[PDB]
């Protein structure tokens, strides 16, 4: 077994976390419990606090952000690691007990609970003109020594450790996607009608999507082209829900359909990041520091969706458009979930919403 | 000597 370890810039404070990724199980989240090693002689009269902060943030991580910025703490938790709380939540876990028995008396545990209605760690891709600034939900843990919570933390004696909330593909498969749409002319009784379907409801990252387009064109109009696309639906919710669409994959072939003739094909399309690096607002999975993460996984939400909405929600749909002569374009959308398998209102808010729509809507 | 900002490493939960 192993545990992550980050220390203070002066070395008088250290944080130990067993994990950096915490999985939402749709009824519970992986509890954030770690160990903080302090120097009681260094802290003559100060206390040690650890914070579990998750915030909707716009702008990069530096201080000289030339332009607009926005932050909104979606959830704040505070723990007084030293002196230890008289009634700490939960008994220390096995890993925490081992860490305490390894590090000695100057190590103390901290416990955090992530609420069930929080977003996952997501990041919207900055635009080529945008100077690294990007929307995104970020989880973090900061340990600092201070007289109280209200006292400002100092860089020398504080240490930050970015954590992530993640989700994985449910074991139970969902219903197979299927969509139907018809477009009949004003005079002819025949009605153009296509069928499309994905072979699966859930696809892993890098896994191709096979769509079964099935066109039954009994009318007198000819389908010039058949376009198959994958679209990403980032759903940013702060105080007003705003949906954003980004096309992430396109398969287009010149397969004309003659009047009074059926059609059937199995198109293959794969969403991937190689051709989408120049797109702004493209939701990507949470990055620890700067690594390349793939496209954002689809956000799975509970049936108990009373509100359940915060941060950014990601959804994927496959669109099959037929470009028909003399107008009359008919389309079908196939919503699918794209995940990873389990390993084995204030003025600032309203103004930022206006800004977000103007930028990436 | 290491005056740069400490990064995240790991340690074995033993002894």
């Amino acid at each position: 077994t192993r545990v992550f370890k980050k220390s203070s810039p002066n070395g008088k404070l250290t944080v130990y976390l067993g994990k950096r990724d915490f999985v939402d199980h749709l009824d519970k989240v992986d509890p954030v419990d770690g160990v903080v090693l302090v120097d009681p002689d260094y802290l003559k009269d100060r206390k040690v606090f650890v914070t579990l902060t998750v915030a909707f943030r716009y702008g990069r991580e530096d201080c000289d952000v030339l332009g607009l910025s926005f932050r909104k703490d979606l959830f704040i938790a505070n723990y007084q690691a030293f002196p230890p709380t008289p009634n700490p939540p939960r008994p220390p876990t096995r890993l925490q007990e081992r860490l305490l028995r390894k590090l000695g008396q100057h190590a103390h545990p901290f416990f955090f609970t992530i609420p069930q209605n929080l977003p996952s760690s997501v990041t919207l891709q900055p635009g080529p003109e945008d100077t690294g600034k990007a929307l995104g939900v970020d989880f973090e843990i900061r340990a600092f020594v201070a007289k109280s919570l209200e006292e400002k933390s100092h860089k020398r004696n504080s240490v930050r450790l970015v954590i992530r909330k993640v989700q994985f593909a449910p074991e139970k498969p969902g219903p197979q996607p299927s969509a139907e749409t018809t477009r009949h002319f004003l005079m002819s009784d025949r009605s153009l009608h296509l069928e499309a379907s994905l072979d699966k409801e859930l696809y892993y990252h890098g896994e191709p999507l096979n769509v079964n387009v099935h066109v039954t064109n009994n009318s007198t109009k000819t389908v010039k082209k058949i376009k198959v696309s994958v679209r990403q639906y980032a759903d940013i919710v702060l105080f007003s829900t705003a949906q954003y669409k980004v096309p992430v994959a396109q398969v287009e072939q010149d397969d004309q359909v003659s009047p009074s003739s059926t059609f059937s094909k199995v198109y293959t399309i794969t969403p991937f990041l190689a051709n989408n690096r120049e797109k702004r607002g493209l939701a990507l999975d949470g990055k620890l520091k700067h690594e390349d993460t793939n496209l954002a996984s689809s956000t799975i939400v509970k049936e108990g969706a009373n509100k359940e909405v915060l941060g950014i929600l990601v959804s994927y749909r496959v669109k099959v458009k037929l470009v028909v002569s003399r107008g009359g374009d008919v389309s079908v959308e196939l919503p699918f979930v794209l995940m990873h398998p389990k390993p084995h209102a204030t003025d600032d808010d309203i103004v930022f919403e206006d800004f977000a729509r103007l930028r990436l809507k | 000597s290491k005056t740069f900002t400490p990064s995240t490493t790991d340690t074995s939960t033993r002894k």
Partner: antibody
Amino acid sequence: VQLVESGGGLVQPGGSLRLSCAASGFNVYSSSIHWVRQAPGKGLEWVASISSYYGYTYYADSVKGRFTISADTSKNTAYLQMNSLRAEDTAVYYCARSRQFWYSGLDYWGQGTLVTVS
Amino acid sequence: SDIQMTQSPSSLSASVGDRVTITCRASQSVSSAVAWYQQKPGKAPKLLIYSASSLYSGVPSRFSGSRSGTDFTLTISSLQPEDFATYYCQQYKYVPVTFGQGTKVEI
């Protein structure tokens, strides 16, 4: 799941050769493809790697510039275009395969194409 | 700079039922991102251990991996005649991925 290779052979020093790696049983975007060579009597050495999901190609310092690695995503095959083949390039080149999400070693290997120079 | 995986010993003589430990030391402090391979002569390599401890699927349970800081060890608890081969130590934390020089196991 196979990593059939083809393309190696005898090449005059300073010549050129292309190695084709016919991948099967997995997708070019959920897996990365790496070229690893093993000179006679010498250990394993990594020369190239391509990530078609991210569009990244990496090369060893001894093959940078001289070697180019490409992928035929539609054909689910990878290529290694080796140019200016010197004496140090003689080896048995293996097409290895690793996961994209995430790297857990080269779980699938080819069978090696013997590349020699005169 | 690159990272050297100093694999020791370069070779060793063993016998059936013996316990063989092959060490690997990284010049730079890589994480658990270390893999082990078994290359019999005339054949392509075969992944045995990944993440320095995770046994690859299908590999016999007699192989095991461990890490002590930057020192990685491959152990065969009950060596079999099928295990006489060359074993390579690879790190994949940083590009380029570097391999150990190998450890030929001989009867």
